[PDB]
Amino acid sequence: MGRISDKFTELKEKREKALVSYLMVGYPDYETSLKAFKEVLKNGTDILEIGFPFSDPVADGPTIQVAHEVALKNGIRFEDVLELSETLRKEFPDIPFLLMTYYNPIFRIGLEKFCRLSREKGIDGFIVPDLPPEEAEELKAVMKKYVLSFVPLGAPTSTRKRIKLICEAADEMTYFVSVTGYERIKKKVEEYRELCDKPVVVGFGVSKKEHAREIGSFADGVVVGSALVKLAGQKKIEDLGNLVKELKEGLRE
User: Fold this and answer.
1) Is the previous residue joined to 28 through a cis bond, with omega within 30 degrees of 0?
2) 45-70 exposure pattern, b = at least 16 Cβ within 10 A, e = fewer
3) Which terminal residue of the chain, N or C, has fewer Cβ atoms less than 10 Å from its own Cβ?
């Protein structure tokens, strides 16, 4: 459909796998995070995951949880998150933007409004790590209305039936975690390939070029977050750009 499908079609013609970079708005502070976002985009990021600070990030690892807390103490609001998206959208017109948000904030703000605002500020789709199954259909329906790409989540232990539900739920792409929360996720993706034609990105545990090359050998893309956030924490912008450049190196053929 939109920017996501266009990007994967583009990467395929370039014989590349996608690098999905995840950073948190407001960590270690708004200004520094904005520089970080610009740096990863300038160095090869194909799809951006924009972190929306949340008070109870139970699905994130230690490093990202720190980013959540710090950003919230800096006073980062949903409005600041979208301002950053709008700002980046002007400089990078075709890079797909995925808003990483927990479910509660969407409900608190209001589904219609949340989606309306996201679309107006450049967001292409969402990644909801803790989406309650009993709230999924309603959210998907609203997202469809505002043309926001729904990205279902899979796991190394997803059943064949779940995989088919994931494929039909995905508008343009899917995201699988790499660990049971390697060989296991690789085999799961192969099954996925049998049942689904939509691109799939794999995350968790990526921090070295070797990791990107290995995962990219069977996935259409890799997601990197904690490794980037760590560098951003010390305002090591140059090293961050270097890391993104290196990761992207392991994603070319």
Assistant:
1) yes
2) bbbbbbbbbbeebebbeeebebbbeb
3) C
Enter the resolution in angstroms. Answer: 2.0
Annotation marks residue 86 as catalytic: no
Catalytic position from the list 60, 80, 172, 220: 60
CB 188 within 8 A of CB 209: no
CATH of the domain at 228: 3.20.20.70
Q: Residue 111 is encoded by which pair of tokens?
A: 């589904």
How many helices (H) and strands (E) the chain has is answered by 12, 9
**Cross-strand pairs, 240:** none
Exactly one of 46, 49, 171, 220 is catalytic; name it: 49
Assess whether 39 carries a catalytic annotation: no
Sole residue written with tokens 């710090």: 70
Q: What total of structural domains would you count in the chain?
A: 1
